[PDB]
Write a protein that binds this ligand. Structure first.
Ligand SMILES: CCCCCCCCCCCCCCCCCC(=O)OC[C@H](COP(=O)(O)OCCN)OC(=O)CCCCCCCCCCCCCCCCC
Ligand SMILES: CCCCCCCCCCCC(=O)OC[C@H](COP(=O)(O)OCC[N+](C)(C)C)OC(=O)CCCCCCCCCCC
Ligand SMILES: CCCCCCCCCCCC(=O)OC[C@H](COP(=O)(O)OCC[N+](C)(C)C)OC(=O)CCCCCCCCCCC
Lengths: 93, 469, 89, 49, 185, 128, 68
């Protein structure tokens, strides 16, 4: 379960403005400004299909890209494992 | 002698093979016989009911406890004979009944805990002995580790006994918090009628009693007795009961309790009714033991209960051993071996035993009618003495419940006899294998005791009147 | 008196209402013994008495042996079955 | 003539090798009247092998 | 500055409640064992507080040092499946859980007093208001501590229970070998 | 505030100093295979445990009783003078009874690891 | 067996009351045992301090409401 918060603008923008004082990259205030600016595609501009290219889209590649962070907690429904497990040796004498 | 036996058998079994455990059991059986023969003159110490305090004031020795110890030795002798002597010299009976290497040691340690329970005078000794009994009897339930049922019973028994031991320890430490003592000798008339103390004491009594199957906590022990091997069931269904009920009878803890009366009535009704639809033998006998435990719960409300308890526990021990031995003897004639551990499970597998062995069915009839309490047998005199005491002490509703339970239990006691005296096709005509001499003699001796022990009742009362009064 | 009764009662409830584990059963037994020992030792201090501390150290020893035996029994159960499941002891 | 009857006249099963089968596992009868063994030599022939 | 350390018994009671809840609640039983260790630490603290640090150290070296170690030893070696604490599975327990909590706590607090009327038996248990006076005597000439006296009584006045605990420990050796080992012949 | 108390609290609530220094100073930009674990290696959804020899668990189960024995000897060594020549005999009996179990442990060979693939020691006999 | 022993190896806090009560029990029979009621009350009072607690409750209440 990915955690998200959704707290207001005047607070997050100030928190970001504060975290620019550390040396490493952080979420910038202009990024939370861009959080209100959705993509407006220019129709006069060329596209992929002018290059004979057909993109992938995100849901088919999300598996490939996110499976390193998949935990894979345990196996599914270990019931129906009892009587087969009964036939193996578990402590060697 | 027990500790000498334990410290000897540990070494001698460590330095011996698995081919020698049967002979080891024979040796220690003869050891116990010699002890019970040569050292039993110590009864003269308890003339006129002289009581002794030993190990500071941690143990108590009187005629009651000496008798219970002789009884426990007799029981251990019989149970060891069942392991040390082969019924038949066949491959089957060398597959079904084999002693495991450590079984005799655990039996002797459990006997030690039993006796240190009955001889206890301080609660620290009681708790140490309760744990020495219960750990050993967990391991006895578990030693046949190639059985799924036995391992399962081991673990259930561990957890339930653990919880009830928590209860016993809470009771003991609360008694200490109130009185600053671990000794029941610290109580008198004044302390009982000046302090309200019945919650602690009945908590102790119930923590001890639910460890032997007192309702509503009976199903778990009945499952344990069902699921264990037959030659383990015969031990674990009897010796803890003797130990704990003897402690609770010697310690006058529940003299007119309403809770113990209620739970005893419940034990009687459950142990009589629940055994009516049982199709298996060991569950039937477990419910029989439950109702007998109820009969013996009733005399925890008396304050003069030694004769009744000793008579009833002796006769119940003899009957229990006899009936389990008859079920063990009947395996040669059953037509279907169920398991390596419980070769006989269902009562209808005894169908037609009178046509294969008729005198075995005579033994069964004697034991069944002693359980029912039919005169001139021994269970009748047991029930009579119990009724005498409880009616002398004013328990009039419990008496009618006792009669009704005696009647309802007869049905499932008679189930066995009825199916045994039924007709069967494919009877036995010849067999060149003969059952053991020793075990046959032991069973015959128990049956003859049940049948002809009433001759000596006058003598027993005259001895009791000198050693217990 | 309070800490011990609380630990005892909560361990008993976590034993009784355990639909999860067997390890929780073991843990609840051990914590129950702990609670009893704490009540016992508080009374030992208030009365200035040694019998309570003696009973407590005896309980320590006996609980250790109990744990050893219980976890041998579990190992036998696992010898035969190979998996100790949510249910079935 | 034989059908097995109980102590109270009730129906009892005649226990065979018939119903130590995988069919008659996974049924929820009480501990008294189950009849599946779990230690039978029919079921436990391949156990820790 | 004086009363900064007054409520250190109440804090241990609170932390014990918390650690028991975490034992019942933890997903992986390894975490339940670790919270049991934390509860042993809290109990050892409380025992130091009431003046029994010897028992605190004995607890640390026995319970945490051996028993918890063996618990971790077995869960590292055995497959112990677990069902997570759920609302579709455990919420049915709330009525009986609450009834039993109230009844068991109130009876456990009532059982310690000898007063006849039932309500007063709880009210005396909560009567922890008045402080104890600690006066000094000069009669104890030796350096006898709690461990010395435990040894004295256990080896003289109570030698029998020690020589019975010996057989209990013999069981602790002989049982597990009988149950875990398979003897060849 | 004693120096004992100061030290035993200070060690835990300061021990994370270099932890924080390392978390703030050091790089952290993981890969998949930097989050990986080995040169080769894999395992399907076969099981969660491996079969182990009995001695591996028996050493731990037997640590408990022998540890309790040696810890129960502490009251004796702190009471040795007061229990003069009586407790001495008692603890000797204690040690002997507990040596009997150790004898059992040795004679059973409970901590020994046994080998399955034995070397063949049987003669070569040819039916003529 | 370990009764009447302190944490320091000697007599406990409430030894004397217990010893008085036991002297009076040794004097008496089960029919004259009610003479030992005040001694047992003293022993239990030393143990649990109920009466002293009630006394101090009265003192505190006079310090409590008769002033404020
Ligand atoms: C072991 C597992 C670990 C968990 C342990 C939990 C803590 C342990 C709790 C105590 C110990 C358990 C006791 C077992 C129950 C049986 C107790 C018993 O039978 O003793 C009763 C006894 C009187 O019985 P008796 O002596 O036989 O008859 C003569 C009467 N003059 O003595 C008495 O008279 C009893 C005194 C009566 C007061 C009982 C207190 C109950 C108060 C509950 C009130 C709750 C509030 C209302 C309901 C709330 C629900 C929302
Ligand atoms: C004792 C071994 C028990 C093992 C089971 C065998 C039963 C032996 C019965 C002898 C009891 C006794 O004679 O004693 C009578 C006892 C008390 O007397 P005592 O202090 O124990 O002295 C006895 C000294 N002995 C050990 C040297 C003998 O009173 C009782 O309440 C006994 C009630 C038991 C009733 C069961 C009667 C069985 C019929 C006996 C047929 C011969
Ligand atoms: C009136 C006495 C009475 O009526 O008792 C007679 C009944 C007889 O029962 P049954 O039908 O023959 O048992 C059936 C057995 N079969 C199926 C094997 C034949 O005893 C009882 O059931 C219990 C007595 C309860 C006492 C109240």
């Amino acid at each position: 379960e990915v955690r998200h918060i959704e707290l207001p603008k005047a607070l997050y923008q100030a928190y970001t403005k504060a975290t620019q004082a550390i040396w490493w990259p952080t979420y910038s205030p202009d990024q939370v400004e861009r959080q209100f600016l959705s993509q407006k595609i220019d129709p006069s501009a060329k596209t992929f299909n002018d290059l004979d290219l057909t993109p992938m889209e995100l849901p088919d590649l999300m598996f490939k890209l996110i499976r390193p962070y998949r935990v894979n907690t345990f196996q599914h429904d270990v019931s129906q494992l009892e009587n087969k497990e009964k036939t193996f040796v578990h402590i060697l004498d | 002698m027990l500790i000498l036996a334990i410290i000897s058998l540990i070494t001698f079994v460590s330095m011996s093979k698995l081919s020698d455990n049967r002979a080891i059991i024979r040796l220690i059986n003869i050891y116990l016989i010699l002890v019970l023969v040569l050292d039993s003159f110590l009864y003269l110490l308890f003339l006129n009911n002289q009581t002794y305090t030993v190990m500071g004031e941690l143990l108590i020795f009187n005629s009651f406890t000496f008798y219970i110890d002789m009884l426990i030795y007799f029981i251990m002798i019989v149970i060891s004979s069942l392991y040390g002597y082969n019924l038949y010299n066949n491959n089957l009976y060398k597959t079904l009944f084999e002693p495991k290497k450590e079984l005799i040691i655990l039996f002797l340690i459990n006997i030690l805990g039993a006796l240190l329970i009955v001889h206890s005078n301080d609660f620290i000794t009681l708790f140490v002995a309760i744990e020495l009994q219960s750990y050993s009897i967990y391991l006895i339930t578990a030693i046949y580790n190639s059985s799924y049922k036995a391992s399962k019973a081991s673990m259930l028994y561990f957890f339930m006994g653990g919880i009830l031991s928590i209860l016993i320890a809470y009771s003991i430490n609360t008694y200490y918090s109130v009185l600053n003592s671990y000794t029941l000798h610290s109580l008198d008339s004044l302390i009982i009628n000046t302090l309200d103390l019945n919650l602690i004491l009945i908590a102790l009594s119930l923590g001890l009693l639910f460890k032997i199957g007192i309702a509503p906590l009976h199903k778990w022990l009945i499952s344990i007795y069902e699921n264990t091997p037959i030659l383990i069931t015969i031990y674990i269904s009897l010796i803890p009961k003797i130990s704990i009920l003897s402690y609770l009878v010697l310690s006058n803890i529940s003299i007119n309790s309403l809770v113990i009366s209620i739970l005893a009535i419940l034990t009687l009704l459950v142990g009589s009714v629940g055994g009516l639809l049982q199709i298996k033998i060991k569950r039937l006998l477990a419910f029989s033991g439950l109702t007998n435990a109820g009969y013996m719960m009733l005399l925890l409300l008396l304050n003069n209960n030694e004769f009744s308890y000793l008579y009833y526990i002796t006769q119940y021990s003899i009957s229990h051993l006899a009936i389990f031995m008859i079920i063990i003897f009947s395996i040669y004639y059953i037509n279907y071996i169920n398991n390596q551990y419980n070769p006989i499970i269902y009562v209808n597998q005894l169908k037609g035993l009178i046509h294969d062995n008729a005198y075995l069915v005579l033994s069964m009839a004697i034991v069944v009618f002693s359980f029912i309490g039919i005169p001139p047998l021994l269970g009748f005199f047991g029930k009579l003495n119990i009724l005498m005491s409880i009616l002398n002490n004013g328990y009039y509703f419990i008496s009618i419940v006792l009669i009704v339970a005696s009647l309802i239990s007869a049905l499932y006691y008679l189930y066995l006899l009825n199916v045994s005296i039924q007709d069967k096709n494919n009877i036995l005509i010849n067999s060149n294998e003969t059952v053991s001499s020793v075990l046959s003699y032991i069973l015959s001796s128990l049956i003859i005791l049940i049948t002809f022990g009433f001759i000596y009742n006058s003598l027993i009362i005259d001895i009791f009147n000198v050693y217990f009064n | 008196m309070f800490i011990g009764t609380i630990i005892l009662v909560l361990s008993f409830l976590g034993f009784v209402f355990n639909r999860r584990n067997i390890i929780l059963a073991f843990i609840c037994l051990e914590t129950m013994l702990l609670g009893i020992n704490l009540i016992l030792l508080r009374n030992s201090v208030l009365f200035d008495d040694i019998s309570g501390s003696l009973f407590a150290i005896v309980i320590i020893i006996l609980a250790g042996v109990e744990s050893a035996i219980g976890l041998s029994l579990l190992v036998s159960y696992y010898r035969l079955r190979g998996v100790i499941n949510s249910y079935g002891i | 003539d034989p059908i097995p009857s109980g102590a109270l006249g009730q129906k009892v099963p005649h226990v065979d090798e018939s119903h130590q089968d995988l069919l008659f596992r996974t049924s929820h009868m009480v501990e008294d009247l189950e009849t599946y063994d779990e230690d039978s030599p029919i079921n436990t022939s391949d156990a820790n092998t | 500055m004086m009363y900064l350390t007054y409520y250190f018994i109440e804090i241990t009671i609170f932390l014990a409640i918390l650690c028991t809840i975490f034992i019942i609640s933890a997903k992986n039983p390894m975490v339940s064992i670790l919270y049991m260790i934390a509860l042993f630490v809290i109990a050892a603290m409380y025992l130091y507080l009431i003046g029994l640090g010897i028992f605190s150290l004995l607890y640390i070296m026995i319970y945490i040092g051996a028993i918890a170690v063996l618990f971790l030893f077995i869960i590292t070696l055995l497959d112990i499946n677990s069902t997570e604490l759920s609302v579709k599975s455990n919420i049915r327990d709330l009525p009986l859980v609450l009834i039993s909590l109230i009844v068991l706590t109130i009876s456990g607090l009532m059982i310690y007093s000898n007063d006849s009327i039932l309500i007063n038996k709880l009210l005396e248990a909560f009567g922890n208001d008045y402080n104890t006076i600690i006066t000094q005597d000069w009669f104890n000439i030796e350096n006898t501590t709690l461990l010395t006296t435990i040894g004295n009584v256990l080896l003289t006045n109570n030698a029998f229970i020690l020589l019975v605990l010996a057989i209990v420990l013999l069981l602790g050796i002989i049982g597990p070998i009988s149950i875990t080992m398979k003897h060849k012949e | 505030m004693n120096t004992f108390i100061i030290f035993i609290i200070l060690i835990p609530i300061v021990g994370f100093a270099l932890l924080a220094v390392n978390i703030l100073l050091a790089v952290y930009k993981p890969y998949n295979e930097k989050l990986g674990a080995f040169e080769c290696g894999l395992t399907s959804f076969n099981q969660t445990r491996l079969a182990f020899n009995a001695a591996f668990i028996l050493v731990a189960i037997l640590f408990l009783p022998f540890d309790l024995e040696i810890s129960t000897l502490l009251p004796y060594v702190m009471s040795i003078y007061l229990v003069s020549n009586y407790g001495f005999t008692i603890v000797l009996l204690f040690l002997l009874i507990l040596i009997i179990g150790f004898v059992y442990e040795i004679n059973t060979n409970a901590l020994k690891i046994n080998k399955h693939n034995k070397p063949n020691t049987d003669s070569l006999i040819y039916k003529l | 067996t370990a009764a009447g022993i302190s944490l320091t190896g000697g007599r406990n806090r409430c030894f004397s009351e217990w010893q008085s009560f036991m002297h009076c029990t040794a004097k008496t029979d089960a029919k004259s045992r009610a003479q030992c009621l005040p001694n047992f009350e003293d022993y239990m009072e030393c143990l649990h301090h109920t009466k002293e607690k009630a006394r101090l409750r009265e003192i505190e209440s006079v310090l409590k409401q008769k002033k404020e």
